[PDB]
Amino acid sequence: HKTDSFVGLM
């Protein structure tokens, strides 16, 4: 999900 895409913030 887009919530898991948060890893891109890292």
PDB file of N, CA and C in Angstrom:
ATOM      1  N   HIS A   1       0.837  -1.187   0.000  1.00  0.00           N
ATOM      2  CA  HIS A   1       0.000   0.000   0.000  1.00  0.00           C
ATOM      3  C   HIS A   1       0.882   1.251   0.000  1.00  0.00           C
ATOM      4  N   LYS A   2       0.226   2.399  -0.074  1.00  0.00           N
ATOM      5  CA  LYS A   2       0.936   3.667  -0.083  1.00  0.00           C
ATOM      6  C   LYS A   2       1.539   3.919   1.301  1.00  0.00           C
ATOM      7  N   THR A   3       0.960   3.258   2.293  1.00  0.00           N
ATOM      8  CA  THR A   3       1.429   3.401   3.660  1.00  0.00           C
ATOM      9  C   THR A   3       2.791   2.726   3.830  1.00  0.00           C
ATOM     10  N   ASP A   4       3.011   1.697   3.024  1.00  0.00           N
ATOM     11  CA  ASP A   4       4.261   0.960   3.075  1.00  0.00           C
ATOM     12  C   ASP A   4       5.313   1.688   2.234  1.00  0.00           C
ATOM     13  N   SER A   5       4.825   2.540   1.344  1.00  0.00           N
ATOM     14  CA  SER A   5       5.707   3.302   0.476  1.00  0.00           C
ATOM     15  C   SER A   5       6.481   4.337   1.296  1.00  0.00           C
ATOM     16  N   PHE A   6       6.076   4.475   2.550  1.00  0.00           N
ATOM     17  CA  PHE A   6       6.719   5.422   3.445  1.00  0.00           C
ATOM     18  C   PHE A   6       8.214   5.125   3.574  1.00  0.00           C
ATOM     19  N   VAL A   7       8.572   3.894   3.238  1.00  0.00           N
ATOM     20  CA  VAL A   7       9.960   3.471   3.311  1.00  0.00           C
ATOM     21  C   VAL A   7      10.804   4.344   2.381  1.00  0.00           C
ATOM     22  N   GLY A   8      10.129   4.946   1.413  1.00  0.00           N
ATOM     23  CA  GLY A   8      10.803   5.806   0.454  1.00  0.00           C
ATOM     24  C   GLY A   8      11.271   7.104   1.116  1.00  0.00           C
ATOM     25  N   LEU A   9      10.692   7.383   2.274  1.00  0.00           N
ATOM     26  CA  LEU A   9      11.038   8.583   3.015  1.00  0.00           C
ATOM     27  C   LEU A   9      12.398   8.387   3.688  1.00  0.00           C
ATOM     28  N   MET A  10      12.770   7.124   3.840  1.00  0.00           N
ATOM     29  CA  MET A  10      14.038   6.787   4.464  1.00  0.00           C
ATOM     30  C   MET A  10      15.183   6.855   3.451  1.00  0.00           C
TER      31      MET A  10
END
